[PDB]
C-alpha cells in the first residue's frame, strides 16, 4: 500500500553524464513495507510535468534509502516525496 509516514533526502543530487537525476529518500514513519507516494510538478507547484523511471519505489523499512532515478522538464521542478504539507518538496533548475 501507499505510505503515510515521514521522509528525508540522505544525499546530494547527482545528475547523470546524460540527463537523469538520482534521489535517495528515507522512512521516518509507520507503514513499512510500503509504496513511496513520490511525484514531480510545475513552477506553479500544481501541473504534474516530469518522468518517473523507478517502477513502484519501495519503502522496505524505517532505515531504508529508496534509490529513485527521474527525468524533470527544462527549468524549475518541485519534487514531492511523501503525503501532505509536512511532505518533502525541493527546487531543481535544469540549465
Amino acid at each position: 500500500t501507499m505510505c503515510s509516514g515521514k521522509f528525508s533526502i540522505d544525499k546530494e543530487m547527482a545528475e547523470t553524464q546524460h540527463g537523469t537525476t538520482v534521489v535517495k529518500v528515507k522512512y521516518e514513519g509507520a507503514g513499512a513495507p510500503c509504496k513511496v507516494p513520490i511525484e514531480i510538478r510545475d513552477v506553479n507547484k500544481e501541473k504534474v510535468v516530469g518522468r518517473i523511471i523507478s517502477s513502484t519505489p519501495l519503502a522496505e523499512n524505517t532505515n531504508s534509502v529508496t534509490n529513485i532515478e527521474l527525468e524533470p522538464p527544462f527549468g524549475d521542478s518541485y519534487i514531492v516525496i511523501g503525503v501532505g504539507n509536512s511532505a518533502l518538496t525541493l527546487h531543481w533548475f535544469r540549465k
Epitope: S8, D10, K11, M13, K24, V65, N67, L90, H91
Partner: single-chain antibody, 227 residues
Framework: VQLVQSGAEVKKPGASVKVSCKAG???????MSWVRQAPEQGLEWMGR????????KYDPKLQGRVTMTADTSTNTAYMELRSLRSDDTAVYYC?????????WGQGTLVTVSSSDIVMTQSPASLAVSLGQRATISCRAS??????????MHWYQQKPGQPPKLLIY???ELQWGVPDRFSGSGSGTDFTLTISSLQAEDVAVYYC?????????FGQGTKLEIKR
C-alpha cells in the same frame, strides 16, 4: 536502525587513532559523519564520507590529519586521526544523515596522554520556569539554503549522552520528539521554541547547517529551570 563504535582508547602525543562504526543498514546510499566533543566543549563536525564513491570532505581545522574510510561490504565506517595532540582528548561519534543526524553511534573516548561560515547561537545559556515558553536563536553568517530549503537543524544533548535530533529542515519535527518543540526561521535567522518547559527539557541545544560543507554546529545553549 543504530550505530556501534569501537571502544575507548588511550594514546600518546604524536600517535594515531582509528575508530570504527558498524551500521545495521547499507551505508552505501548515506553520508557518514564524524563529530567530536572535547570535555565541556560543544559539538564539532569533523568531516563526512559518501561510501559509494569514497568522497571525503573534512573540516579545514582537521584537514591533512584525518582520513575517513568506509567499506560497504562490512557497513563499517572508519576515522583515522593522526598526530594526536593533547587537545584531541574527546568523545568521538559517527552519525548518519544529511538533513540532520537521526542516527548516532554511542561515542568513543580518545584520551591523549604522555571565507568559512559562522554559526551564532543566542543566548549561551538561559533559565525559564517550568511550564514557561523558552526560545533559542541561531543566526548563520551565510544563507544555509539548498534546493529552496533551509538546511538548519536542532539537536538536544544531556550529559554523557550522545546528541538527539529534534528539528531538521528548519521546521520538521523528528519522530518521538514532543509537540511543544517548534522549529522556525528562514534565510540566516532561525529559532527553536519550547512551549511548556518540562524538567526533561534541561539539556544543551545545538543548531547545525548542512547545505554545503563544513556542516558546522553552533556553540550550544545550556537551558535550565529558573531557580
Amino acid at each position: 536502525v543504530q550505530l556501534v563504535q569501537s571502544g575507548a582508547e588511550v594514546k600518546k602525543p604524536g600517535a594515531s587513532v582509528k575508530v570504527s562504526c558498524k551500521a545495521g543498514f547499507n551505508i552505501k546510499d548515506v553520508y557518514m559523519s564524524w563529530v567530536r566533543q572535547a570535555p565541556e566543549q560543544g559539538l564539532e563536525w569533523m568531516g563526512r564520507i559518501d561510501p559509494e564513491n569514497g568522497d571525503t570532505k573534512y573540516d579545514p581545522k582537521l584537514q591533512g590529519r584525518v582520513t575517513m574510510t568506509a567499506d560497504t561490504s562490512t557497513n563499517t565506517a572508519y576515522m583515522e586521526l593522526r598526530s594526536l595532540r593533547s587537545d584531541d582528548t574527546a568523545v568521538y561519534y559517527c552519525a548518519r544523515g544529511w538533513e540532520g543526524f537521526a542516527y548516532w553511534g554511542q561515542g568513543t573516548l580518545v584520551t591523549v596522554s604522555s571565507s568559512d561560515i559562522v554559526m551564532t547561537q543566542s543566548p549561551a545559556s538561559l533559565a525559564v520556569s517550568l511550564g514557561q515558553r523558552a526560545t533559542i536563536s541561531c543566526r548563520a553568517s551565510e544563507n544555509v539554503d539548498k534546493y529552496g530549503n533551509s538546511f538548519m537543524h536542532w539537536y538536544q544533548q544531556k550529559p554523557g549522552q550522545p546528541p538527539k535530533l529534534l528539528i531538521y529542515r528548519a521546521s520538521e519535527l523528528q519522530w518521538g520528539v514532543p509537540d511543544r518543540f517548534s522549529g522556525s526561521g528562514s534565510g540566516t535567522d532561525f529559532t527553536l521554541t519550547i512551549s511548556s518547559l518540562q524538567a526533561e527539557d534541561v539539556a544543551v541545544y545545538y543548531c547545525q547547517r548542512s547545505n554545503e560543507v563544513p556542516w558546522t554546529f553552533g556553540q550550544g545553549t545550556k537551558l535550565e529551570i529558573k531557580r
